[PDB]
Structure 1
Amino acid sequence: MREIVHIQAGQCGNQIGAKFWEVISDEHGIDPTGSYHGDSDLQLERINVYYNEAAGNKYVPRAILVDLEPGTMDSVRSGPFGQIFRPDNFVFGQSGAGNNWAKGHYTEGAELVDSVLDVVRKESESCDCLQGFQLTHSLGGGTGSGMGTLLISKIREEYPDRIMNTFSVVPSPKVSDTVVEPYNATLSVHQLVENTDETYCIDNEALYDICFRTLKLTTPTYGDLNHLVSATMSGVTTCLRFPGQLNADLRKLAVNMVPFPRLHFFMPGFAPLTSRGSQQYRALTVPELTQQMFDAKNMMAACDPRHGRYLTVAAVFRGRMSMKEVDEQMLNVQNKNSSYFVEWIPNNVKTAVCDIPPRGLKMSATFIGNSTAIQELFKRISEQFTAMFRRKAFLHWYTGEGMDEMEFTEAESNMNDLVSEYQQYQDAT
């Protein structure tokens, strides 16, 4: 029960799952063929949440993959764990996005979505009891920006009660992947706050330095950067899938983390992080995990929690650890960092304790942050937005694909109406 349908979108949104589904299947002992090889009977206790049990004692990931070109979908099946997916779920267009939100939401998105919304519906009745949908995409490109959000508005009409969370990729502050990424951000951020219950923002630029300053990786490729994305997503649902002393799910991490229904942009963190030449000198204790999280260089977003206050904090723990070693540390980080939290929410620390550690470690954790430091993350987008839009830069491509200025003007001020909320709750009493 409580099954989750996994949906992907974009070139970034596909290769994450090739890393993501490699990690989840190795938490239950699954070959790339699709059979079972585990030793303990606990691994099949909640196996049905990411697996529809097929015939022949095989297992398939309840996953739907969406692109606008075949340049990625053939690359997934020709790698490791590309054999696990069902060949019917690869729904994709033929031409390509062209890195355009207008083509990603109006031109090709109107055609391909009917070949997806039946497949989601085909996985809807496959679920014995549906929990919610998770989405993996980006915000700078074309496919991950528009075609992701075009699914979200149709799903929320079909499922108002079901939860929704998107592991999006917020673009970096200084270096630029996409030239038109301020237009692709604001026109998609206007859609995220309409029909998503929570969002976990991940920056590329922070994940470069986490792999370099902490892991000391000489050549960090995407087979290692996307591994930290998978360690976050597996660290959230790890209480839904295993017995623990204090359970948690995607609903407990949604009610206790969102005070107001538009203030739901989060920041993830992971702990511990050991280098291959710096692991044999560390004391693996629970208070070592706590002080590693709350600094700047362990956040997975370009954010400064020193210039900001937290509102809600969720920590999900894995492994056979005690409670007084956890609960006393959660109190002490509120006392010494008393200016770093908010005043009108008393004791804003959420505790989640599981009993299955990650394979390869003994104890671990997963950090979920919610602070008003993301107001710099959106105003810097909004500063680049108002500079380009007043020059009508790159505007005729969107205008040529059926789009008016009032689409921009409402979406511009709605971000300004978003940040003005955060600054209002930042320094009140």
Structure 2
Amino acid sequence: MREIVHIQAGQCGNQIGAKFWEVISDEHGIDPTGSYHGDSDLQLERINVYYNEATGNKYVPRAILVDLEPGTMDSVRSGPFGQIFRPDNFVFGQSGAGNNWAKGHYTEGAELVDSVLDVVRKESESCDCLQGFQLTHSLGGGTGSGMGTLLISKIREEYPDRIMNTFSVMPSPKVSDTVVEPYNATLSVHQLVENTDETYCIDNEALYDICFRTLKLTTPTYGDLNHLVSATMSGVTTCLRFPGQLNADLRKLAVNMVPFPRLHFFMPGFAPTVPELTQQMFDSKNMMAACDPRHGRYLTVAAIFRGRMSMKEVDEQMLNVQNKNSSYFVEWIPNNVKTAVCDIPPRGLKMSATFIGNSTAIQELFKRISEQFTAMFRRKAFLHWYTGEGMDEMEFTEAESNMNDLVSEYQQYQDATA
């Protein structure tokens, strides 16, 4: 009875979240109508974490769909699992955000934010013991970034003692389709650094490379990329959704993954013999964030293996990776690599592994955005679009300072010794 309230905002948030509900609905064996037609009772032991039990034994996700542009709502509602969701949980506007963070955070999103919190109060009050919230959104746009972080700030006011998770698609180093994304990303990161307990960094360029270089898709699409992200989201939340040797929640994950409150930005991975999975799983080629783990040290790591597989074999292989490449792990957090196993594998797979790393190498990402942010901000390029919504330049300078301070923090523990 540790329920999670899911929220998805913006195109990216809704497209990624919609595919996420498709994935776990299959894992819990729930059809688009919301009725269970599975085989094992282990699919239901912890189903109330992500679903409400409705009259007629229909299952309804604790999902809240948000955007300032109604177009993406209609796509969700007409998608494979469109009619699963609660009609009243579609909270949308008509104006859109125009890739403008200020519109999403201060004007257009501020008009709609209360309506979203009202839907949150419904869901949260209908929870035996509310555990926390999870958000899926992009940082480069205006709604998921600007309004997304506004929703986070408001939720922390009502629920200051609850856990806030996010799955944030970050700007990629070379692939971009938004000219002002450095402004939007830097403004969002300064919000995420303060009002989130855990943030999974997702990079579309890395996801595209996997789809193209590895999976051999000659014409990858956002559907293919979303499938990879959804597969990772299911893998991360496997322990929250299924029983097993591990009985842990989101707060325990944060307590053990975050040695310092601001450094809570994780590097996700996914794979694909047991030895070969652990080899893949730690590979740069399998990392969902555009940062080389070899360019830093892991503060903490979490690995989840799924499917019938030799436990002792995994333990030996994991322990080998730690001891073999121990120079990439901080020496002052003893036993900072923990592993969990679940008997239920995903669809069309016999074995799978999900990776969650709190690596100091993630500062490379915040370096990039800072340098891109400064190049535009020095010349106040495109700024009038933000000051026109009522922002002041000082709010831009503060975000620049904070993300540089965050970058400064990461470098501190990347060279710390015992």
Q: TM-score with structure 2 length normalisation?
A: 0.97
Kindly indicate whether the alpha-carbon contact (under 8 Å) linking 1:257 and 1:313 is maintained by their aligned counterparts in 2: yes
**Cα distance in 1, alignment partners of residues 248 and 177 from structure 2:** 36
More helix by share: 2
Cα contact 2:291–2:364 (8 A) shared by 1: yes
Pairwise CA distance, 1:223: 2.2
Partners in 2 of 1:110 and 1:28 — Cα distance?
36
Cα distance, 1:318 vs structure 2: 1.5
1:355, distance to aligned residue in structure 2 (A):
2.1
Report how far residue 209 of structure 1 moved: 0.7
More deviation in 257-266 or 368-377? 368-377
Shift of 1:29: 1.9
State how far apart, in whole Å, the 1-side matches of 2:293 and 2:143 are: 31
In 2, are the aligned partners of 1:270 and 1:365 still within 8 Å (CA)?
A: yes
User: How far has the Cα of 1:40 moved from its partner?
Assistant: 2.4
- Counterpart Cα distance in 2 of 1:184 and 1:83: 32
Asked whether the 8 Å contact 2:306–2:343 carries over to 1, the reply is yes
1: distance between equivalents of 2:152 and 2:363? Answer: 24
Which of residues 284, 295, 298 in structure 2 aligns to 1:310? 298
Q: Is the 8 A contact 2:281 2:353 kept in 1?
A: no
- Structure 1: stretches of 5+ with no match in the other structure: 273-284
Contact 1:9 1:136 in 2 (8 A): yes
C-alpha deviations, 1:14-61, integer Å up to 9, x for none?
Answer: 111221111111112222122221122222222211211111221111
Q: Please, which moves more after superposition, 219-228 or 106-115?
A: 219-228
CA contact (8 A) 1:4 1:49 kept: yes
- Whole-angstrom CA distance in 1 between matches of 2:45 and 2:110: 40
Q: Residues 271 and 292 of structure 1 are in contact (CA less than 8 Å); yes or no, is this contact kept in structure 2?
A: yes
The alignment partner of 2:286 has SS state of coil
Shift, 1:3, TM fit: 0.7
What is the match of residue 319 of structure 1?
307
Distance in 2 of aligned mates of 1:79 and 1:244: 33
Q: Which 4+ stretches in 1 moved above 4 angstroms? A: none
Cα pair 1:248 1:352 within 8 Å, conserved = no
- Preserved contact between residue 2 and residue 249 of structure 2 (Cα < 8 Å): no
What are the superposed Cα offsets for residues 268-303 of structure 1, whole Å, 9 maximum, x if unpaired?
00011xxxxxxxxxxxx2211100111211100111
C-alpha deviation, 1:400, in angstroms: 1.3
Q: Is the 8 A contact 2:104 2:110 kept in 1?
A: no
Shift of 1:384: 1.1
Q: In 2, are the aligned partners of 1:237 and 1:249 still within 8 Å (CA)?
A: no
Segments of structure 2 that go 5 or more residues without pairing to the other structure are: none
- Asked if structure 2 preserves the Cα contact closer than 8 Å seen for 1:70 and 1:94, the reply is yes
CA deviation digits over 1:330-365, x for unaligned, max 9?
Answer: 221122212211222222101112222213222221
Identity of aligned residues (%): 99
Paired residue secondary structure (1:366)? strand
The CA deviation at 1:378 is 1.0
Question: 2:381 corresponds to which residue?
Answer: 393
Instruction: Output one character per residue of 1:201-221: Cα deviation in whole Å (capped at 9) or x when no partner.
Output: 000000011112211112222
1:88 matched to 2:98: no
The TM-score, its normalising length taken from structure 1, stands at 0.95
Could you tell me how far 1:409 is from its partner in structure 2?
1.5
Maintained 8 Å contact 1:6/1:62: yes
Which of 386, 391, 394 matches 1:403?
Answer: 391
Question: C-alpha root-mean-square deviation of aligned residues, in Å?
Answer: 1.3
